[PDB]
Amino acid sequence: ALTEVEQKAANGVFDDANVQNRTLSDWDGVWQSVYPLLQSGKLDPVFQKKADADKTKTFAEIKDYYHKGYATDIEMIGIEDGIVEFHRNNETTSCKYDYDGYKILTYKSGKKGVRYLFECKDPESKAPKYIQFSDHIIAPRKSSHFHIFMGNDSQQSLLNEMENWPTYYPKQLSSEEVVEEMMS
Ligand SMILES: [Zn+2]
Ligand SMILES: [Zn+2]
Ligand SMILES: [Zn+2]
Ligand SMILES: [Zn+2]
Ligand SMILES: [Zn+2]
Ligand SMILES: [Zn+2]
Ligand SMILES: [Zn+2]
Ligand SMILES: [Zn+2]
Secondary structure (H helix, E strand, O other): OOOHHHHHHHOOOOOHHHOOOOOHHHHOEEEEEOHHHHHOOOOHHHHHHHHHOOOOOOHHHHHHHHHHHHOOOOOEEEEEOOEEEEEEOOEEEEEEEEEEEEEEEEOOOOOEEEEEEEEEOOOOOOOOOEEEEEOOOOOOOOOOOEEEEEEOOOHHHHHHOOOOOOEEEEOOOOHHHHHHHHOO
16 A cells, blocks of 8 residues: 555665654554564564575574564563553553654665664653654554664663664464554
């Protein structure tokens, strides 16, 4: 359902003038971490497809890359009415996040991506002070899945993080629906 501008942008190619602000509501819903899907072998067909289409890396090497990438103990994330809550160890934290703009990044490959920045200003909240969404979308559209970076140092410290990117899909998807979306 993507305009070809959207299409190329999801592949990391776009001009800075086409990036646009996004509200937190683009991420409304209940989301499952995909790390447990990795840890149970259910994402293995993704890693094997990528391994078979690339001469430089083996299945195990791709699997280890995404094991590092997806690792997190935030199992679920719920987003609604301006509030993000993070599920961890049978407890949640939550905050009403304020939008703080976006940041356009150029990866070492030459591909580009956009991070959408939010900040918690609730002295009562125990949620992360800074979060960043990144989901291969650069202008308003309901997200299909997202990477999130979370931290309590600064937004810049998050901008530096390129190895760990907890990734989330809608709760209702089965592991096979997740695998199918990932192979596209
Ligand atoms: Zn620019
Ligand atoms: Zn090797
Ligand atoms: Zn709730
Ligand atoms: Zn509502
Ligand atoms: Zn919970
Ligand atoms: Zn991605
Ligand atoms: Zn790190
Ligand atoms: Zn996708």
